[PDB]
Subunit: 254 residues, 4 copies
Amino acid sequence: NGILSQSIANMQQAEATIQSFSGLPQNAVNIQQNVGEVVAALLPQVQTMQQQVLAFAARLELQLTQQLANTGPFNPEALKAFVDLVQQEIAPIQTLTAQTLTASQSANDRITQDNIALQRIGVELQATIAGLQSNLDGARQELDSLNKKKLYLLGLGLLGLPGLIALAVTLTQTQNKVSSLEGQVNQIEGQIQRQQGFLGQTTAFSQQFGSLIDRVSKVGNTISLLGGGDPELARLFFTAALTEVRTLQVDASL
Amino acid sequence: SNGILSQSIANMQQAEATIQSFSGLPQNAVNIQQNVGEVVAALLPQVQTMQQQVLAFAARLELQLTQQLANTGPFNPEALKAFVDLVQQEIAPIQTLTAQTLTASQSANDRITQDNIALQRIGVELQATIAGLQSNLDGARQELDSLNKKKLYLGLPGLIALAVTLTQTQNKVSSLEGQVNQIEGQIQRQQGFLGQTTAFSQQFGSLIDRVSKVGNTISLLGGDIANVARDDPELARLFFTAALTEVRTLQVDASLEHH
Amino acid sequence: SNGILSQSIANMQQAEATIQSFSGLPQNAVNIQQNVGEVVAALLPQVQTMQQQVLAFAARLELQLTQQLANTGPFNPEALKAFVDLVQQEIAPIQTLTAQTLTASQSANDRITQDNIALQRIGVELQATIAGLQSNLDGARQELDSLNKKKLYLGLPGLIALAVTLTQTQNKVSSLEGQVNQIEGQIQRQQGFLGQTTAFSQQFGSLIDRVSKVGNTISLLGGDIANVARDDPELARLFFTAALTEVRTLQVDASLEHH
Amino acid sequence: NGILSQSIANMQQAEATIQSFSGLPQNAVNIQQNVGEVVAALLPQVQTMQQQVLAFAARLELQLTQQLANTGPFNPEALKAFVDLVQQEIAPIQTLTAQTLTASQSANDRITQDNIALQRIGVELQATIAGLQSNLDGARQELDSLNKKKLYLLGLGLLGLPGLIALAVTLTQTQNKVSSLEGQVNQIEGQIQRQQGFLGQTTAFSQQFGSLIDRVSKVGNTISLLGGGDPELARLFFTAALTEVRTLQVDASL
C-alpha cells in the first residue's frame, strides 16, 4: 500500500544513524556523502513525483469516465485532439519519473560497491587479528605462569626473595608485551565492531531504496503505456487507458 | 597507542552518538539512550579521574618502595611501622574511589542489560504479529482468487455488486501488505538499535573488567603492606619487593597509553 | 543449470540433514525436526510430481494451440466449443493438484514459523536467566572480597571457622560460573538451530512463491480459454495467442533446468 | 567450574552439525576433517588427562597433609627421597598435558586460518551477485513492462492482435533472460547461506576449543610449579605445594 512513504521514512532514519558514525574508512565516507545527497535531493523529488502522478491520474480518470459516458457523433477530430492533450500533459511527468529512476539506480549501485569494499576491509582486519591473538594467547599463558610463580615464592618467606627479584624483571616485560598486544587486538576489534554496525545500517538503507526504485519503475512503466477508426474503437481504448490510470492511483497511493 | 580504559571510553563515546540517532522507539529504548547519555556525560569523566589518581598514587609508592629497597642497613621496626601507616592512609581513598566507580558502572550496565531484554521481548511479539497478519494475507489472497474464479465463471446486476466487494478486498490485501511492511520496518530499526546497545555494553564490560582488575591489584597490594605492620624484620624486604610488583601492575593496567 | 523449484528442493534437502544434527533441544525444536523430516520425505516428491505434470500438460497444450493458430481458414464454432471443453477438462486436475501442493506447503511452513517464534521466546528467557545469575555472581564476588578484606584484617578459632565459610563461597562463585557457561552453551545451540530453521523457511518461501506463480498462470490461462467458449468467432485467434503466452510462461517457470 | 566437561560436550555437538554439511569448498572440507580428528582423538586424551591429574592431585594432597602432621627427626634423607618420588610421578602427566596443549593449539590455528579463507570466498560471492542482480533488476522491470503491455493489447480486441504476436516473441526472450539470471543469483545466495551457517558452527567450535585450551594451559602451569635445610623449610615448602595441588583439583574439577 503506502510503500513509497514507508520506504522514505525508513531511509531518513537509516541516513541519520549513518551520519552519526566517525573515524571510518573512505568507503564508508563515500556512503555517508551519497546517502546525504539521496535524502536531501532524491527523496523530495520522489514526493513531488508522487503528488504530480496522483494529481494527473485523478484528472484523467475523471475525463475518461466522462468520455465513456458521452453520446453524439463519433468525432475523430475530438479523439486525436484529446489524446494529443494527454500525451502533452503526461510528457514531463514521464521525464521526471525516468530521471528519478536513473539517478536512484545510479546512487544505489555506488552504495552497493562501497559496501562490498567495506566487507573486504572487514575480513582483512579479521586476518590481522588472527596473527596477533596467537602471540597474545602465548603471552597470557606465560603471564599466568609468572603470577603463580610469584605467589609460590611469597609463601617461601626469605628463601623466595632471590626468586622473587629475578621474577619481577620478567613479569614487567611480559605485562608490557601483553599490554601492547591486547591494546592492538582491542583497537582492531573496535574497528570491526563499528564497521559491522555501519554496514547493518547501509544494508538496511540499500534494501529500502531498492523497494522505492521497484515502485518507481512500476509507476514509470504504467506511464509509458498511457504516453505511447470505428465507434467501438474508442470505447475499448478509453476503457484500456482507464484501467492504467486506476492502477497508477493504486501503485502511487498515499 | 591508547590503552584499554582509554579505548573503551572512546568506543563508548562514539557508540553513544549513534544510539542517540534512533527515534520513534519504545520506552525501554529511551531508557538506554538517557542511561548511556549519563554514563558518557558523568561516569566516564569519573573513570578518567580515578585513572589519573591511581597513576599518581602508583608513581609515588613506586618511588617510595624503591628507596626502601635501596637501603642496605637493617630496618628500624618503628619507621617501618610508621611508613606502613602512611601507605595504608594513602591506599585508602584510592581503594574506595575505585570501588565507587566499579559499583556505579555495574548498576548502569545492569540497567542496559534489563532494558535490552525487555526490548528483545517486544521484538519477539513483533514477529508473532507479522506471522498473524501474514496469515490474514495468505488468506485474503485466497478470497481474492475465488472471487476472480467465480467471476471468470460469469447478468449485469451481479457485477455492479461484485465489483464493490472485489475493490473492498484488494483494499484489504493492500492494507495488510502495508501493515506487514510497517512492522518489518520497526523490527529492522529495533535490531539495528539492539546491535548498538550490545556493542556499547561489550565496551562497558571491558571497562568494568579493567576497573575490577585494578581494584583487585590494590587489594593484593594492601595485603603486602599489612604483612609488614604485623611483623625477623628483614621480612620487610620480601613484602616490599612484592608490593612493588603490584604497584607496577597498576601502572601497566591503568596507563593512558598501552606499551 | 538447476531452476528455482529444483534449487529450493535441493537446498531444503541439505538444510534438513543439518537440522536433524542438533540434539538436546526443546519440544518446539523437535517439532521443526519432524515437520522438516516429513516435508522432505513426502511434500517435496509431490512438488516434483506436480512439476513434471505441469510441464507435460504445458507441452501438449503448446502444441495444440500452435496447430489451432496455423489454421488459415475461419473457425467452426462447434469444434472451437469442443476443443475448449477438452482443454478445460485437461486444465482442471492440474489446477487442483497445484492448489493442493500450495496449501500443504503453506500449512507446514506456517508451523515452522510458529515453532520458531516459540523458540525465540525461550531464548529471551534464557537471557533473562543469565542476567540474574550474572548478578548473583557480580554479588558473590563482593562476598568473596570483603571475606578476604576481613581476613587480611586478621585468634585461631576464628579462622578454623572462616576457612569453612570461605570455601563454601568459592564453591558458590564456581558453581555460578558453571551455570552461566551452561546456559550460554544452550543459547549458542539455539541460535545455531534457529539460523538453520530460518534458512530452511527462506528456501521454502521461495518454493511457495514459485508454486503460487504457477497457480496464478494456470488461472490466467483458464481465463483465456473461457473467453473462447463464451464467444465474431475470429476472437479465438486473440485468446489463443494469449493462452499460448501463458503456456510458455509455465514452461519457463516450472522447468527442471533454468535457461 | 565444570568448564572442561562443558567445553567437550559443546564441541561434540558443533562437530556433529559441521559433518552434516556437503558440497562446500575445500577450506570447509579441511575444517570437517580436522574437527573430526579433534573429537575422535584430542578430546578423549583431555578426558584421560583430567582423570590422571585428579587422581595424582588427590594422592599427593593426602601425602602433603600427612607430612605437615608428622613429628620426629628432620630427615633430609626423607625430603629429597620424597620429592624425587613426586617429580617422577608428575613427569609423564606434565608430558601428556604439554602434548595436549601443543596439539590443540595446532589444530585450532588451522580452523582459524580455514575460517578466514572461507570468509574471503564469502565476500567474493557477494561481489559476483552485485553484478548479476544489476542485470536481473533491469530484466525484471522490462518483463513487468511487457506483462502490462500484454493486458493492454488483450483489452483492444483484434486491433491488439498484431501487437500481441510481436510482443510474445520478446516476452519469451526476456522471461528466459530473467530465468537464467534469477537462477544464477539464487545458486550463489544458496552458497552464501550454507557457508554463513557453516562458519557459525565452526566459530562456535573454535570458541569452545579456545576455552578448553585456556584451562589446559592453566593446569599445565600449575603442574610445572610442582614439577620444578632448616626444619621450618619443609613446613613452608609442603604448605606451598599443598596450595598448588588444591588449585589443581579446582582447575581440573569434574
